[PDB]
Structure 1
Amino acid sequence: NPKAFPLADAALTQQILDVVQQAANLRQLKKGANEATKTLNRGISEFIIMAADCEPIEILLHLPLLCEDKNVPYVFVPSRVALGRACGVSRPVIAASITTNDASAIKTQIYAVKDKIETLLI
């Protein structure tokens, strides 16, 4: 997909899926484009994770536009099987949202990953 940008390299992919994994352990995660869309409407999302191998792609091309509207970080990941795997789900999930928690213990990891995304978007 020529439209798949920005996309995460493998080390930052392992980092991001680790942060998603721990947020799923810390109950800090939304699955599906519906729940991520609703958290974008609530303004309570830290950042957005999207799968780049999702066929078709038109079900989630609006989410970069809305994240550009709300100034919300987002980087594509090239796998959806790993993306649903890090959600603790035995299915490929293509969309995830990180809910806001200022009392979270992995919030420094969230600020580091958001530093990576704000590095990649500029």
Structure 2
Amino acid sequence: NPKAFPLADAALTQQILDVVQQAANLRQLKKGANEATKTLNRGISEFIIMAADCEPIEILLHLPLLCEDKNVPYVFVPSRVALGRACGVSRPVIAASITTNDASAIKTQIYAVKDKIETLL
């Protein structure tokens, strides 16, 4: 019913945020709504993470429409200030994208969370 849907429970967010920080260290993370759109258009995204407290929430509802059309899992997180923390950038981030790389060192963790997101969806 709410526009921000599905939005992860507490335990899932830490698993999500843990992957984001690892992806940031490994240069596999794209941060910000505009980059996420580009990755979806390129078909290079494993999945999309988004903030449900964005003010207004509306400015990031274009991404799920793109995500579904490419069959890309997506999920919201309650806090944007917390999402920026995981990304490693000095500022809040409302949307982030994990770039696809089957040769990455964190492939198992990315697919682990990715499976949970689909079950949520």
1:108 aligned partner = 108
Match of 2:59, SS state, is coil
Give CA deviations for 1:18-71 in whole Å, capped at 9, x if unaligned. 000000011110011110000000001110000000011221111111111000
| Regions of 4+ moved over 3 Å | none
Q: How far apart, in 2, do the equivalents of 1:56 and 1:85 lie? A: 20
Give CA deviations for 1:73-116 in whole Å, capped at 9, x if unaligned. 11100000010111112211101000011111111111111110
Q: How far apart, in 2, do the equivalents of 1:41 and 1:4 lie? A: 22
| Structure 2: runs of 5 or more not aligned | none
Match of 1:59, SS state, is helix
Q: How far apart, in 2, do the equivalents of 1:62 and 1:113 lie? A: 23
Q: How far apart, in 1, do the equivalents of 2:60 and 2:68 lie? A: 14
Q: How far apart, in 2, do the equivalents of 1:80 and 1:65 lie? A: 20
1:93 aligned partner = 93
Q: How far apart, in 2, do the equivalents of 1:11 and 1:25 lie? A: 22
After TM superposition, the structure 1 stretch with the greater mean CA deviation from structure 2, 1-10 or 79-88, is: 1-10
Quote the offset at 1:118 in angstroms: 1.0
After TM superposition, the structure 1 stretch with the greater mean CA deviation from structure 2, 86-95 or 42-51, is: 86-95
Q: Aligned-pair RMSD on alpha carbons?
A: 1.1
Q: How far apart, in 2, do the equivalents of 1:59 and 1:71 lie? A: 21
Quote the offset at 1:117 in angstroms: 0.8
1:61 aligned partner = 61
Identity over aligned residues, as a percent? 100
Quote the offset at 1:2 in angstroms: 2.2
